[PDB]
Short mmCIF file of C-alpha atoms and ligand atoms in Angstrom, two decimals:
data_model
loop_
_atom_site.label_atom_id
_atom_site.label_comp_id
_atom_site.label_asym_id
_atom_site.label_seq_id
_atom_site.Cartn_x
_atom_site.Cartn_y
_atom_site.Cartn_z
CA UNK I 1 28.74 107.38 17.43
CA UNK I 2 29.30 104.45 19.81
CA UNK I 3 31.27 101.28 19.12
CA UNK I 4 30.54 98.67 21.78
CA UNK I 5 33.14 96.11 22.86
CA UNK I 6 35.87 98.22 21.31
CA UNK I 7 39.54 97.51 21.94
CA UNK I 8 40.40 98.98 25.34
CA UNK I 9 42.64 101.66 23.81
CA UNK I 10 39.86 103.11 21.67
CA UNK I 11 37.54 103.17 24.67
CA UNK I 12 40.32 104.83 26.69
CA UNK I 13 40.86 107.64 24.20
CA UNK I 14 37.20 108.74 24.48
CA UNK I 15 36.94 108.35 28.26
CA UNK I 16 37.62 110.37 31.40
CA UNK I 17 38.20 107.02 33.18
CA UNK I 18 39.90 103.68 32.63
CA UNK I 19 37.88 100.46 32.67
CA UNK I 20 35.24 101.03 30.00
CA UNK I 21 34.73 99.26 26.69
CA UNK I 22 32.75 101.53 24.36
CA UNK I 23 34.48 103.94 21.96
CA UNK I 24 32.60 107.24 21.42
CA UNK I 25 33.48 109.49 18.49
CA UNK I 26 32.03 112.03 16.09
CA UNK I 27 30.63 110.31 12.99
CA UNK I 28 32.87 112.41 10.71
CA UNK I 29 35.57 109.92 11.75
CA UNK I 30 38.52 111.59 10.03
CA UNK I 31 36.84 111.73 6.61
CA UNK I 32 38.83 114.03 4.29
CA UNK I 33 42.06 113.59 6.25
CA UNK I 34 45.04 111.39 5.36
CA UNK I 35 47.50 109.45 7.48
CA UNK I 36 50.81 108.14 6.22
CA UNK I 37 52.05 105.03 8.01
CA UNK I 38 55.82 104.92 7.59
CA UNK I 39 56.66 101.36 8.50
CA UNK I 40 56.83 97.82 7.04
CA UNK I 41 53.92 98.56 4.68
CA UNK I 42 50.16 98.05 4.89
CA UNK I 43 48.14 95.06 3.69
CA UNK I 44 45.67 97.23 1.76
CA UNK I 45 43.48 94.25 0.81
CA UNK I 46 42.55 93.66 4.45
CA UNK I 47 38.73 93.90 4.71
CA UNK I 48 39.19 96.10 7.79
CA UNK I 49 40.52 98.93 5.59
CA UNK I 50 37.47 99.00 3.30
CA UNK I 51 39.49 100.22 0.31
CA UNK I 52 40.72 103.28 2.23
CA UNK I 53 44.32 102.03 2.42
CA UNK I 54 46.94 101.97 -0.34
CA UNK I 55 50.68 101.56 -0.65
CA UNK I 56 52.29 104.65 -2.16
CA UNK I 57 56.02 103.92 -1.79
CA UNK I 58 58.55 101.21 -1.06
CA UNK I 59 62.35 101.11 -0.98
CA UNK I 60 62.46 97.33 -1.29
CA UNK I 61 61.72 94.66 -3.86
CA UNK I 62 58.04 94.74 -2.88
CA UNK I 63 55.50 97.06 -1.26
CA UNK I 64 53.94 94.08 0.52
CA UNK I 65 53.93 94.06 4.30
CA UNK I 66 55.62 90.72 4.96
CA UNK I 67 55.94 91.51 8.66
CA UNK I 68 52.60 92.71 10.00
CA UNK I 69 53.76 95.59 12.16
CA UNK I 70 52.87 98.31 9.62
CA UNK I 71 49.48 96.70 9.06
CA UNK I 72 48.84 96.64 12.81
CA UNK I 73 49.76 100.31 13.21
CA UNK I 74 47.62 101.27 10.19
CA UNK I 75 44.74 99.37 11.75
CA UNK I 76 44.96 101.41 14.93
CA UNK I 77 44.96 104.61 12.91
CA UNK I 78 42.05 103.83 10.66
CA UNK I 79 40.60 100.32 10.42
CA UNK I 80 36.82 100.02 10.74
CA UNK I 81 36.93 97.98 13.97
CA UNK I 82 40.34 98.70 15.47
CA UNK I 83 40.88 102.29 14.34
CA UNK I 84 40.59 105.74 15.87
CA UNK I 85 39.74 107.56 12.61
CA UNK I 86 37.50 105.10 10.82
CA UNK I 87 37.05 107.14 7.64
CA UNK I 88 40.58 108.47 7.09
CA UNK I 89 42.64 107.63 4.00
CA UNK I 90 45.73 105.54 4.77
CA UNK I 91 48.96 105.74 2.76
CA UNK I 92 51.69 103.16 3.30
CA UNK I 93 55.37 104.01 2.95
CA UNK I 94 57.56 100.94 3.34
CA UNK I 95 60.85 102.13 4.84
CA UNK I 96 61.25 98.94 6.93
CA UNK I 97 61.98 95.52 5.49
CA UNK I 98 60.01 92.40 6.41
CA UNK I 99 62.27 91.89 9.43
CA UNK I 100 61.18 95.33 10.69
CA UNK I 101 64.61 96.85 10.03
CA UNK I 102 65.59 99.89 8.01
CA UNK I 103 68.69 101.95 7.36
CA UNK I 104 68.41 105.53 8.61
CA UNK I 105 69.09 106.80 5.07
CA UNK I 106 66.01 104.94 3.80
CA UNK I 107 63.88 106.17 6.70
CA UNK I 108 65.00 109.75 5.97
CA UNK I 109 64.18 109.33 2.27
CA UNK I 110 60.72 108.12 3.29
CA UNK I 111 60.06 111.19 5.42
CA UNK I 112 61.12 113.57 2.65
CA UNK I 113 58.94 111.52 0.30
CA UNK I 114 55.85 112.13 2.44
CA UNK I 115 56.55 115.86 2.61
CA UNK I 116 56.37 116.00 -1.18
CA UNK I 117 53.83 113.23 -1.78
CA UNK I 118 51.05 114.93 0.16
CA UNK I 119 50.92 117.39 -2.75
CA UNK I 120 49.79 114.44 -4.90
CA UNK I 121 46.97 113.42 -2.55
CA UNK I 122 43.55 114.76 -1.64
CA UNK I 123 43.54 115.57 2.07
CA UNK I 124 41.40 118.70 2.47
CA UNK I 125 41.12 118.27 6.26
CA UNK I 126 44.85 117.72 6.81
CA UNK I 127 47.76 115.31 6.74
CA UNK I 128 49.30 113.18 9.51
CA UNK I 129 52.29 110.82 9.56
CA UNK I 130 52.71 107.96 12.03
CA UNK I 131 56.30 106.80 12.64
CA UNK I 132 56.35 103.67 14.81
CA UNK I 133 60.10 103.25 14.50
CA UNK I 134 63.36 104.63 15.81
CA UNK I 135 66.95 104.03 16.82
CA UNK I 136 69.84 105.81 18.51
CA UNK I 137 70.24 109.58 18.41
CA UNK I 138 70.81 110.99 14.93
CA UNK I 139 70.68 114.68 14.07
CA UNK I 140 69.90 113.75 10.44
CA UNK I 141 66.92 111.59 11.42
CA UNK I 142 65.61 114.32 13.73
CA UNK I 143 66.08 116.93 11.01
CA UNK I 144 64.10 114.83 8.52
CA UNK I 145 61.24 114.52 11.01
CA UNK I 146 61.43 118.28 11.60
CA UNK I 147 61.21 118.96 7.85
CA UNK I 148 58.21 116.70 7.50
CA UNK I 149 56.45 118.54 10.32
CA UNK I 150 57.45 121.94 8.94
CA UNK I 151 56.01 121.01 5.53
CA UNK I 152 52.51 120.83 7.04
CA UNK I 153 52.23 117.26 8.32
CA UNK I 154 51.31 116.34 11.90
CA UNK I 155 54.19 114.01 12.77
CA UNK I 156 53.65 111.49 15.57
CA UNK I 157 56.63 109.32 16.55
CA UNK I 158 57.17 106.46 18.99
CA UNK I 159 59.09 107.31 22.16
CA UNK I 160 60.78 103.89 22.10
CA UNK I 161 60.62 100.69 24.14
CA UNK I 162 63.81 100.93 26.22
CA UNK I 163 62.31 102.01 29.58
CA UNK I 164 64.76 104.90 29.28
CA UNK I 165 64.99 108.62 28.61
CA UNK I 166 63.97 109.22 24.99
CA UNK I 167 66.53 112.05 24.64
CA UNK I 168 68.94 109.37 23.37
CA UNK I 169 66.72 108.15 20.52
CA UNK I 170 65.59 109.46 17.12
CA UNK I 171 63.21 110.67 15.89
CA UNK I 172 61.81 110.56 19.48
CA UNK I 173 64.16 113.32 20.61
CA UNK I 174 63.13 115.83 17.92
CA UNK I 175 61.39 118.69 19.75
CA UNK I 176 59.12 119.80 16.90
CA UNK I 177 57.31 116.47 16.39
CA UNK I 178 54.85 114.73 18.71
CA UNK I 179 56.66 112.06 20.76
CA UNK I 180 54.35 109.36 22.10
CA UNK I 181 54.81 107.15 25.18
CA UNK I 182 52.72 104.07 25.98
CA UNK I 183 50.24 103.28 28.75
CA UNK I 184 48.34 100.16 29.82
CA UNK I 185 44.64 99.51 30.49
CA UNK I 186 45.11 100.30 34.19
CA UNK I 187 46.62 103.72 33.42
CA UNK I 188 50.14 102.64 34.28
CA UNK I 189 53.04 103.73 32.13
CA UNK I 190 53.77 100.67 30.00
CA UNK I 191 56.75 98.91 31.56
CA UNK I 192 58.85 99.26 28.39
CA UNK I 193 57.85 102.83 27.57
CA UNK I 194 60.51 105.47 27.25
CA UNK I 195 59.97 108.74 29.12
CA UNK I 196 61.68 112.10 29.61
CA UNK I 197 61.29 115.77 28.76
CA UNK I 198 61.04 115.08 25.03
CA UNK I 199 57.74 113.20 25.43
CA UNK I 200 54.62 115.15 24.48
CA UNK I 201 51.83 112.67 25.17
CA UNK I 202 50.95 109.09 26.12
CA UNK I 203 48.58 106.76 24.31
CA UNK I 204 47.41 103.15 24.76
CA UNK I 205 50.35 100.83 24.03
CA UNK I 206 50.02 97.58 26.02
CA UNK I 207 47.94 94.69 24.62
CA UNK I 208 46.54 96.49 21.58
CA UNK I 209 44.29 94.50 19.24
CA UNK I 210 44.51 95.47 15.57
CA UNK I 211 44.83 94.16 12.03
CA UNK I 212 47.57 91.78 10.95
CA UNK I 213 48.74 90.35 7.64
CA UNK I 214 46.93 87.46 5.98
CA UNK I 215 43.64 89.21 6.74
CA UNK I 216 44.02 88.42 10.43
CA UNK I 217 44.14 90.23 13.78
CA UNK I 218 46.61 90.33 16.61
CA UNK I 219 47.30 91.90 20.01
CA UNK I 220 50.81 93.32 20.47
CA UNK I 221 52.48 95.95 22.68
CA UNK I 222 54.78 98.91 22.15
CA UNK I 223 55.15 102.64 21.80
CA UNK I 224 54.62 101.62 18.16
CA UNK I 225 50.99 100.92 19.15
CA UNK I 226 50.54 104.15 21.13
CA UNK I 227 51.77 106.31 18.26
CA UNK I 228 48.96 105.44 15.79
CA UNK I 229 46.32 106.19 18.47
CA UNK I 230 47.71 109.73 18.56
CA UNK I 231 48.06 109.93 14.76
CA UNK I 232 44.47 108.77 14.29
CA UNK I 233 43.33 111.21 16.98
CA UNK I 234 45.04 114.08 15.16
CA UNK I 235 43.36 113.14 11.87
CA UNK I 236 39.99 112.91 13.63
CA UNK I 237 40.45 116.33 15.27
CA UNK I 238 41.63 117.92 12.02
CA UNK I 239 38.48 116.68 10.26
CA UNK I 240 36.44 118.30 13.05
CA UNK I 241 38.32 121.56 12.41
CA UNK I 242 39.53 121.65 16.02
CA UNK I 243 43.21 121.86 15.13
CA UNK I 244 45.78 121.84 12.32
CA UNK I 245 48.99 119.97 11.53
CA UNK I 246 51.12 122.70 13.13
CA UNK I 247 49.19 122.77 16.39
CA UNK I 248 47.71 119.29 16.79
CA UNK I 249 50.35 118.03 19.24
CA UNK I 250 49.81 121.13 21.42
CA UNK I 251 46.03 120.75 21.14
CA UNK I 252 46.17 117.07 22.08
CA UNK I 253 48.33 117.95 25.09
CA UNK I 254 45.98 120.85 26.01
CA UNK I 255 42.95 118.56 25.95
CA UNK I 256 44.52 115.38 27.37
CA UNK I 257 43.52 113.57 30.54
CA UNK I 258 45.96 115.06 33.06
CA UNK I 259 47.71 113.48 36.04
CA UNK I 260 45.94 110.13 35.68
CA UNK I 261 48.87 107.84 34.79
CA UNK I 262 51.00 105.99 37.33
CA UNK I 263 54.77 105.46 37.38
CA UNK I 264 55.44 108.57 35.32
CA UNK I 265 58.97 109.68 36.27
CA UNK I 266 59.44 113.15 37.71
CA UNK I 267 59.87 115.53 34.75
CA UNK I 268 57.84 113.58 32.19
CA UNK I 269 54.39 114.81 31.13
CA UNK I 270 51.45 113.04 32.74
CA UNK I 271 49.10 113.42 29.78
CA UNK I 272 46.93 110.76 28.14
CA UNK I 273 45.43 111.32 24.68
CA UNK I 274 41.72 112.09 24.87
CA UNK I 275 39.22 113.07 22.17
CA UNK I 276 37.00 115.17 24.47
CA UNK I 277 34.00 113.86 22.56
CA UNK I 278 30.68 114.48 24.28
CA UNK I 279 28.02 112.21 22.81
CA1 LIG H 1 57.03 119.75 21.37
#
């Protein structure tokens, strides 16, 4: 399949070169997979989700995304126009309030929720979780992310936007999950992107167009935007039978565009998520 005039990040993920604008992907498009977006929620009524999104959990007075950030991330995972895996099922878990904040205890509860909740969902091709959030180092937060991964979920987490070594942030610093840095349309490390040994992969993170609340669309930047590209990619690859939850991060790294990013600090992987789709 070919989507012309796609957001640059989608085009990037199916290309051996920067500077193109068509997204190429296998028509299966993540059908039969599921992606949990653990964030401020998802506006499920957005036409871009085509009925494939639903809220499954909140820790607040409402499951509504009153912020937009969760809706944007969900859009990059799986919206019809702005998404990597255009036929995946999206499940929203609202661990962040409408200000985009959340106590670590609530975030941890949300991760353990997903590990159980997948047993209540139909995801024959596999399960992914996208965590576009984080804070300072916490062994408890890392351990929760590790449990989620261990339970059979491909966990993708944001590296963070501190232009610093991600070893000092959680869940970014958890070794067993897939930690995602951000790049721009010119294959530069995004200026805010964290880096370091704990990073596993980079994805498009600067100036990313996706869904927003009120049935709208929006371009924003962050490792929060890179993460759902990788989560959607994992779901897409799992539907193709190319990988599994336990090995998707490794597979994505194995098959990534290598050595093509600029301003990657010595000791950080120079790997850019790539679907290796040959039309
Ligand atoms: Ca790893």
